């Protein structure tokens with residue numbers, strides 16, 4: 427039927443769970459605390475954590491450089507890049 431919240435919104439959710447676990451392992455928090463709308467400032471993602479997270483996302487989700495991660499608002503903007511890279 428009609429798209430909700432968008433067309434192919436479920437294809438982001440398949441990648442966003444892998445992103446959330448990959449972020450959780452980088453910052454040392456429980457995986458249940460992470461979610462798509464969470465700001466990267468609220469997760470403490472400084473330059474060193476971003477350089478680690480880029481390598482971790484390349485190993486566990488899809489290839490990405492830290493130059494993309496410095497441009498992000500939240501994990502919803504990131505998963506739109508990685509779902510399109512596959």
Ligand SMILES: *P(=O)(O)OCC(C)(C)[C@@H](O)C(=O)NCCC(=O)NCCS
Nearest residue numbers: 467470471472473474475476477492496
């Ligand atoms: P990245 O190498 O671009 O930056 C790393 C950083 C630790 C400097 C950055 O993430 C940051 O927190 N910048 C703000 C620093 C600040 O407002 N005051 C100095 C705190 S020691």
